[PDB]
């Protein structure tokens with residue numbers, strides 16, 4: 001098909017962190033030819049083999065259906081509901097939809113970062129500077145997608161709204177199970 005791949009940074013702006021050191025972030029990755037879908041995120045997840053806080057994790061999700069280059073609304077809704085329940089405290093999603101040829105490179109980068117979970121050289125979690133949002137920004141930067149400028153203090157809820165100023169918006173509500181894509 002030659003259809004561009006999809007990278008969908010997702011932020012859960014109403015996610016509650018509760019204890020110190022707003023929102024959580026993850027990323028959906030979709031093969032534009034096949035609809036094969038991956039989800040990765042970085043956060044304060046348990047790891048018995050590392051004493052350094054912060055780990056990448058992969059969450060299994062359904063694949064989407066691509067029809068004439070587009071993701072069908074229903075198949076994306078199924079993934080968004082999965083991600084909200086499994087990673088997002090059953091809250092709403094604010095996202096952007098990015099396009100390019102990068103599926104294998106993104107998959108390799110994410111698996112490579114996950115391979116660092118037990119490394120003595122793993123960069124420690126930092127709520128301000130090395131967190132769920134900066135993981136995704138660093139991925140998009142690495143793909144050549146030129147994400148929005150990263151401030152010294154990265155707040156997922158604030159950053160995603162900045163990112164949306166220059167990209168396609170994705171809004172999803174878990175309670176109503178409704179998706180809206182907009183400029």
Ligand SMILES: [Ca+2]
Nearest residue numbers: 094161164169
């Ligand atoms: Ca918004």
Ligand SMILES: [Ca+2]
Nearest residue numbers: 164167169183
């Ligand atoms: Ca926008």
